[PDB]
Amino acid sequence: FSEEQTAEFKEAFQLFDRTGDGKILYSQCGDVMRALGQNPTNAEVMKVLGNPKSDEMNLKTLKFEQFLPMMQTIAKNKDQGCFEDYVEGLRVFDKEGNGTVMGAEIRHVLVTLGEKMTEEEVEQLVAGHEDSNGCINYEELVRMVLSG
Amino acid sequence: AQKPLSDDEKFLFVDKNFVNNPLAQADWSAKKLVWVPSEKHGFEAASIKEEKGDEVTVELQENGKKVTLSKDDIQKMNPPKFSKVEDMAELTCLNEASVLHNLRERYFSGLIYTYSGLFCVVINPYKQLPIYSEKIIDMYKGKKRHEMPPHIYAIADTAYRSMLQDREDQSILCTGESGAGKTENTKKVIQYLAVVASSPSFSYGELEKQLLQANPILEAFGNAKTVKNDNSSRFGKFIRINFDVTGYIVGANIETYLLEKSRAIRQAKDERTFHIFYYLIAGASEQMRNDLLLEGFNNYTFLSNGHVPIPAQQDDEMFQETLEAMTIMGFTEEEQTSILRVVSSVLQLGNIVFKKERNTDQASMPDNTAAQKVCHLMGINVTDFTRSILTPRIKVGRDVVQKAQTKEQADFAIEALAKAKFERLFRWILTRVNKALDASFLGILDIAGFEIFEINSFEQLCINYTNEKLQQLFNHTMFILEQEEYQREGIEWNFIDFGLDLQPCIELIERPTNPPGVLALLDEECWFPKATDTSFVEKLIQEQGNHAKFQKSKQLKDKTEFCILHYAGKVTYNASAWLTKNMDPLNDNVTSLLNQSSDKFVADLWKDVDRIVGLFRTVGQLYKEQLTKLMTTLRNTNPNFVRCIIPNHEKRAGKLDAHLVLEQLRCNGVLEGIRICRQGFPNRIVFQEFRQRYEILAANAIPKGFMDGKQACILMIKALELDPNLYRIGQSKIFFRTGVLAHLEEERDLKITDVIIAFQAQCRGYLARKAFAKRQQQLGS
Numbered sequence A: 001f002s003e004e005q006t007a008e009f010k011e012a013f014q015l016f017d018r019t020g021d022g023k024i025l026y027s028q029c030g031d032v033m034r035a036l037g038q039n040p041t042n043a044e045v046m047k048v049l050g051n052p053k054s055d056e057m058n059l060k061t062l063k064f065e066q067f068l069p070m071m072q073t074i075a076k077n078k079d080q081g082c083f084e085d086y087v088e089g090l091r092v093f094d095k096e097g098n099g100t101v102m103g104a105e106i107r108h109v110l111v112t113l114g115e116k117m118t119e120e121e122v123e124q125l126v127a128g129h130e131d132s133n134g135c136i137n138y139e140e141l142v143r144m145v146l147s148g
Numbered sequence B: 001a002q003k004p005l006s007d008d009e010k011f012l013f014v015d016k017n018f019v020n021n022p023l024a025q026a027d028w029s030a031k032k033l034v035w036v037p038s039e040k041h042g043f044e045a046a047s048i049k050e051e052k053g054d055e056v057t058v059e060l061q062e063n064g065k066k067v068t069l070s071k072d073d074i075q076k077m078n079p080p081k082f083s084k085v086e087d088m089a090e091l092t093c094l095n096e097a098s099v100l101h102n103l104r105e106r107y108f109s110g111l112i113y114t115y116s117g118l119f120c121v122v123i124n125p126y127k128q129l130p131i132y133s134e135k136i137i138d139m140y141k142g143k144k145r146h147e148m149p150p151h152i153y154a155i156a157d158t159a160y161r162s163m164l165q166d167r168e169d170q171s172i173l174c175t176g177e178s179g180a181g182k183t184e185n186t187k188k189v190i191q192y193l194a195v196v197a198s199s200p201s202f203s204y205g206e207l208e209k210q211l212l213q214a215n216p217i218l219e220a221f222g223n224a225k226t227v228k229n230d231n232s233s234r235f236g237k238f239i240r241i242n243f244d245v246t247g248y249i250v251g252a253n254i255e256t257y258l259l260e261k262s263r264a265i266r267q268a269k270d271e272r273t274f275h276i277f278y279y280l281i282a283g284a285s286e287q288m289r290n291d292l293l294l295e296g297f298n299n300y301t302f303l304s305n306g307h308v309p310i311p312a313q314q315d316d317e318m319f320q321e322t323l324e325a326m327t328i329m330g331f332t333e334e335e336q337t338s339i340l341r342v343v344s345s346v347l348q349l350g351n352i353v354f355k356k357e358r359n360t361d362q363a364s365m366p367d368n369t370a371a372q373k374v375c376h377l378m379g380i381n382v383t384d385f386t387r388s389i390l391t392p393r394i395k396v397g398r399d400v401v402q403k404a405q406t407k408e409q410a411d412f413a414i415e416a417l418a419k420a421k422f423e424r425l426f427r428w429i430l431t432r433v434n435k436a437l438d439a440s441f442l443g444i445l446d447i448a449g450f451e452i453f454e455i456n457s458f459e460q461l462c463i464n465y466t467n468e469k470l471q472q473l474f475n476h477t478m479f480i481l482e483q484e485e486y487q488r489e490g491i492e493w494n495f496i497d498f499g500l501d502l503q504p505c506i507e508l509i510e511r512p513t514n515p516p517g518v519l520a521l522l523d524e525e526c527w528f529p530k531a532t533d534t535s536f537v538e539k540l541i542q543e544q545g546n547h548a549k550f551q552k553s554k555q556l557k558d559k560t561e562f563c564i565l566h567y568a569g570k571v572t573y574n575a576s577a578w579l580t581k582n583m584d585p586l587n588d589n590v591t592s593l594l595n596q597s598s599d600k601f602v603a604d605l606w607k608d609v610d611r612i613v614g615l616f617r618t619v620g621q622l623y624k625e626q627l628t629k630l631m632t633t634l635r636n637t638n639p640n641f642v643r644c645i646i647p648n649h650e651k652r653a654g655k656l657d658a659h660l661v662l663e664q665l666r667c668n669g670v671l672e673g674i675r676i677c678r679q680g681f682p683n684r685i686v687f688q689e690f691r692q693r694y695e696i697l698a699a700n701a702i703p704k705g706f707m708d709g710k711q712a713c714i715l716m717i718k719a720l721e722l723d724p725n726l727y728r729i730g731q732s733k734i735f736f737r738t739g740v741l742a743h744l745e746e747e748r749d750l751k752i753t754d755v756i757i758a759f760q761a762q763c764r765g766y767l768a769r770k771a772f773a774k775r776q777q778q779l780g781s
Ligand SMILES: Nc1ncnc2c1ncn2[C@@H]1O[C@H](COP(=O)(O)OP(=O)(O)O)[C@@H](O)[C@H]1O
Pocket: B124, B125, B126, B127, B128, B129, B176, B177, B178, B179, B180, B181, B182, B183, B184, B185, B229, B230, B231, B232, B233, B449, B644
């Protein structure tokens, strides 16, 4: 990471802490990384965390300086999903090829398959894409999160 | 080889993590171990020592007793590999005994909710099992059918997602006779949906908060203790929850049926009236009590059996509870008290007894104390009401014949006044409530169960009548109907008669035109002057005397009665005073005196009194005219049966009646139900959709061209080398065997998880960076 951007990196990091030990809670790391424009999976982060436990996660620390190595390492990986395949799977839920799925079909899926996002995550995520009949065009939803 | 489960999970799941004991498996050699009769057990294992042809010699492996029987009295035993199986459709050997066993086990082991084909068995525990809580509610949310054990919360979710999926309103109907659980199961279904579709202790929505206080009210004055239910649902109930395009609750409605108020006047032996009566008499305050004229418990002649105590229930606190429920809703402080006074007033009308004048034969009001105290509760005029109920200032229209009735008819009129001034109220509340709890909608039918006593009044007739109706519905939608779709589509099927139809026993009490039915006859025969309870009965035989489901009373002790050959049994009803209520006779003199009473509440109660009797429709048809509405929408929704089964008549838990439980299973068409489930293809799917979903599992199958949904789907199925015996092909739809679809579903889900995980992570990133951007803004502000 560059010095100019790395400096801003620190800012964004320390902006993530109530009191001021300048320590990013063990759990409070994911969002910090993402905020820096990173989309690390809910696995990688854990992998780099030695795989702490939920209990210790809420009572663990992490200095910006300590965070740095993790940031880059994570920043450097191999693959990243995209429209081509992302939606591809989203299409499979197409009622009858409506080129648009529903608000439940989507919500249910995104919260029963793999890294399940909480009721919230799903609700507030698509919250506004479902129309009158309550349909959310995927070939546009994914884009809102990706390109967004 | 799996996880460990606490004493509590030992009520949902089973204990499989055990030794691969070769004991139970060794004995496998004596496969000659079968089932056989019993007087105390009903069934029992025993091994064939000598097959003497049509008769085989056997010895029960219990008392080493050598009880031999015919080669047709035994019964195929299922491998010990099935002991206490989740879905009885899995049992390799299906018997009247096999299933009895399974139920025997799981029941006595803490598990009641079992699975039988498409429907589900649910023996009554009669105990307080810790299997209902905010936790269990969670554990099942989103959890598929097999991804968890059989539970009421299970059916609720299965039904709910089914609706949201195939866009097709649904219905969960709990069968079974009076005392088996019907209610509780319904409550669980509602409790679950209240949180599993909202938008122990938990913070629900606002309507869900009330939608929760709906039944704790209708149970008050509507539910009451009988000799087969400490708290029996004394009427029919149909809750309909309305979901939006996002599967969220927004409205709920209840359609109340047959409020058996007929017990409000004189409740049977070892029974009570509508709970609320006692909750007030004891829950009221010295002040409030003095504000509505309510005395002691053995003081009112309206409370037969004096005062009856209900176990583990304190009407004292019960009152407070029910009071709290009203409030949650919208029943203002006054709005409640107004209803209360009515109750005490109704109880009072019970003390109003007449002294049939020897001189003129006209009733007399010696001590008016009674009446005086009731009027002040009605808001009507003393003198006025007194004379009206006494000396009816009748109006035959074509004249103004003022008459007077004996003390009797004087009593019979004040009785059918109080008794209907209450029902005038029951429906008041129900529509007061239904106003607050109000594309999709889920239906919960809490009808009443097949009761049969020593005196089978009219009420008890339409009650059991409804039961038979729902029973027929089951058989129909199960064996009947389904088979039809097999024929229609053409699939290589064949009909199989499950011997289950009660149409007859219905017409015997249904069809008006053509041979008339027990009710049809009573109907008009009652409009007649020289018409009597008696006369009626004879008419009945005068035409139906040749019906199997019909039978001539054995004992005519002194009066007249008759018994019917129901699906649930036979019941000797006593036609006495039948036509006497089928018309709903009543002193309209006081009626309109009320219509213009000062008690607005009571004024609003009888405000619309243009149907009263002073001389339209018969109760009978008025009912079958609404109980026809029911079955019209049901057949228009998707049934989901919760076959609640009573365990024993001792009202004692831990006890499980053999045969009783066994017969209920038979008279509920269980075994046959499982037969169709495993016999036919209880699953179907139109081409388009099938190929639309399960293609990612068969990419290299269908060419690039747009071809016949039939041949395209065929190519798919062929690719996964589906066994030509799990599924059956049709015109435009596939008939897969059970779970043969679940496999496809799971495989497909698997083939996308990653992508779902990948995108899930992307969505998280968006979420994370988005929320954090908003908080950053607050600080700066
Ligand atoms: N799952 C259950 N858990 C606890 N008690 C139950 C259960 N099912 C039934 N009961 C008990 O048996 C009584 C009768 O049950 P209920 O639901 O009122 O029967 P039904 O409506 O079929 O006539 C209940 O009041 C309760 O004591």
